[PDB]
């Protein structure tokens, strides 16, 4: 019974170490992805305004 209890304490504490490591690494994915997608849609914003300004100059042509 001693063996069962202290093995369960050790395996659960490394399970929570790997789970908290996964929390920090998936938060790293989350905020890296936040910066990435945010800047990506601002350059796609500038892509949209470039397309419309170009078709306006096509119109005046």
């Amino acid at each position: 019974t001693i063996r069962n209890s202290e093995e369960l304490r050790g395996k659960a504490i490394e399970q929570l170490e790997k789970a908290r490591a996964r929390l920090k690494k998936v938060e790293m994915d989350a905020d890296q992805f936040r910066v990435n997608g945010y800047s990506e849609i601002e350059r796609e914003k500038m892509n949209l305004i470039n397309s419309t300004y170009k078709t306006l100059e096509q119109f005046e042509n």
Binding site: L48, I49, T52, T55, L56, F59, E60
Partner: protein, 53 residues
């Protein structure tokens, strides 16, 4: 929506530029018809030498 409104306003501006340019050139051709009359006389006098051998 913001750049589509900019497109529509620019399109109105170029339309009014069009009407100004076309009315100007119609006034211009009114001027060259109302003027340019020795051209008319000489152009009649030139073809009369071509209708006959």
């Amino acid at each position: 929506l913001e750049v589509e409104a900019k497109l529509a306003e620019g399109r109105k501006k170029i339309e009014v530029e069009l009407q100004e340019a076309l009315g100007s050139l119609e006034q211009q051709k009114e001027d060259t018809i109302k003027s340019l009359d020795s051209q008319i006389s000489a152009l009649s006098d030139d073809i009369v030498k071509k209708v006959l051998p």
